[PDB]
Design a protein around this ligand. Structure first.
Ligand code: HEM
Ligand code: OH
Length: 154
């Protein structure tokens, strides 16, 4: 699939607000993912012991992880679909090292949309949410194809 430039601009205008405080947005996204789909926390060997939202919020390592994840995703979005180089290493680590099914990529995509809808009504109206869903679907579609090339079902 292919996004229009207008759609990419709606994605990048909300991402500019995320970048005001990437750490805080990453904590909210993880808290939402782990609360909504608790099975996903089991994939993180360093964090799977966390029991409550308060513990998740206080984890300096989880906060650092969130920054890494949103910064990598932000670099993919800024390529506006020309993200083959960025997707290579990520697909390899997520298929082979971490073993993250496509379904769990759908769960984190849902969590990102939920947090942007909550924090950024000014830049996350219906058209902008639609454009971000398209961008994240494109990301998952391209990751899934790479998973298959790498020998992972997903
Ligand atoms: C937007 C989708 C995602 C992005 C951009 C992303 C990005 C990253 C990056 C950049 C790293 C560090 C380098 C690497 O190992 O590749 C990482 C590590 C990791 N990712 Fe993801 N990730 C995503 C989704 C997920 C999901 C949904 C899960 C699990 C349910 C997951 C599980 C992990 C784990 C377990 C690690 C190792 C963390 C640690 O060092 O403790 N990832 N991810
Ligand atoms: O992650």
């Amino acid at each position: 699939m292919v996004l229009s430039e207008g759609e990419w601009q709606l994605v990048l205008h909300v991402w500019a607000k995320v970048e005001a405080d990437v750490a805080g947005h990453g904590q909210d996204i993880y808290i939402r993912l782990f609360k909504s789909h608790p099975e996903t926390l089991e994939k993180f060997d360093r964090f799977k012991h966390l029991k409550t939202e308060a513990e998740m919020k206080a984890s300096e390592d989880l906060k650092k992880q969130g920054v890494r994840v949103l910064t990598a995703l932000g670099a993919i979005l800024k390529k506006k679909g020309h993200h083959e180089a960025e997707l290579k290493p990520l697909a390899q680590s997520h298929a082979t090292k971490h073993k993250i099914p496509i379904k769990y990529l759908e769960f984190i995509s849902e969590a990102i949309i939920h947090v942007l809808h909550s924090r950024h009504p000014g830049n996350f109206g219906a058209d902008a949410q639609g454009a971000m869903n398209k961008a994240l679907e494109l990301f998952r579609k391209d990751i899934a194809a790479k998973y298959k090339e790498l020998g992972y079902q997903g």
